[PDB]
Amino acid sequence: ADPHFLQQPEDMVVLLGEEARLPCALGAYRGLVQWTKDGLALGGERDLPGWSRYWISGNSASGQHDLHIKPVELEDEASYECQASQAGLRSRPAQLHVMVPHHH
Amino acid sequence: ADPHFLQQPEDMVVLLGEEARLPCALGAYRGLVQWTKDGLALGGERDLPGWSRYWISGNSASGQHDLHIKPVELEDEASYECQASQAGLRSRPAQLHVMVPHH
Ligand code: NA
Ligand code: NA
């Protein structure tokens, strides 16, 4: 079978300072998987070097490639895609909304 | 120095079937470099596996990361960016137009 998504991320709202999980799963695909943030590719290495608060979790052999962000910051509000780079397959874009908690 | 572009691609028109070179060079950066095509990241391996007509040319030691396309097809018309993925650096987008002679 051809490469295909088994799970795709969706629009979500997360609180400032919490952890975000943007899910992605691919079937019949053994190549590079990575995430883009407003069109900027973050890279394929699982700990995402250069992005101290981002990493990819999940068993890559089983096809899971979830993007995690912790702690979430205001600058994380963006449109994210999961991409199978070698097959040209792109997920639906997922908008991450960051809400600031108000306290007193 | 901080990572910075030494050369960036620009808009270009290429005749259908010819070879295109979109130039990119980075200074003070040894991490991952890759190209996006209309926002689709092509990957970092210099042979660009999965893309039979694309490859990245140049020695990454010198910091040159030119995207090559041969032969150019209509499906290659797109906006291209060279990106230093670990630094968050993006080049100016470069539009590749393909010209088809008519006869
Ligand atoms: Na990281
Ligand atoms: Na290739």
Rg (CA), chain B: 13
- Taking the mean position of all CA atoms in its chain, how far away is CA A101? 23
Q: Mark out chain A residues that contact chain B at CB-CB < 8 A.
A: 31-32, 34, 36, 39-45, 49-51, 81, 83, 85-88, 90
Are A90 and B40 in contact, with CB atoms under 8 Å apart?
Answer: yes
How far is it, in rounded angstroms, from Cα B94 to Cα B23?
10
Q: Which residue of A has its CA nearest to B79?
A: A39
For A56, A85, B43, B49, the CA distances from A31, given in Å and listed in that order, are 15, 7, 10, 9
Query: Strand (E) positions, chain A?
Result: 4-7, 12-15, 20-22, 25-27, 33-37, 40-41, 54-57, 66-69, 78-84, 89-90, 94-99
Query: What whole-number distance in Å separates Cα of residue B53 and Cα of residue B20?
Result: 10
> What residue of B is the nearest CA neighbor of A89?
B40
With beta carbons less than 8 A apart as the criterion, state whether B67 and B54 touch.
yes
**Block residue for tokens 């470069």:** B94
Beta-carbon separation of B50 and A31 below 8 A = yes
Judge whether B42 and A85 are in contact, CB under 8 Å: yes
The answer to whether B88 contacts A31, with C-beta atoms less than 8 Å apart, is no
The reply to whether residue B85 touches residue A42, judged by beta carbons under 8 angstroms, is: yes
Tokens representing residue A70 in the block: 């912790």
How close is the Cα of B3 to the center of ligand 1, in Å? 18
Q: Report how this structure was experimentally obtained.
A: X-ray
CA of A102 to the centre of ligand 2 (A): 50
Nearest 5 degrees, angle CA A31-CA A36-CA A38? 160
* Residue-range domain boundaries for chain A: 1-104
Output the CA B53–ligand 2 centroid distance in Å. 6
Task: Compute how many other C-beta atoms are within 10 angstroms of the C-beta atom of residue B3.
Answer: 18
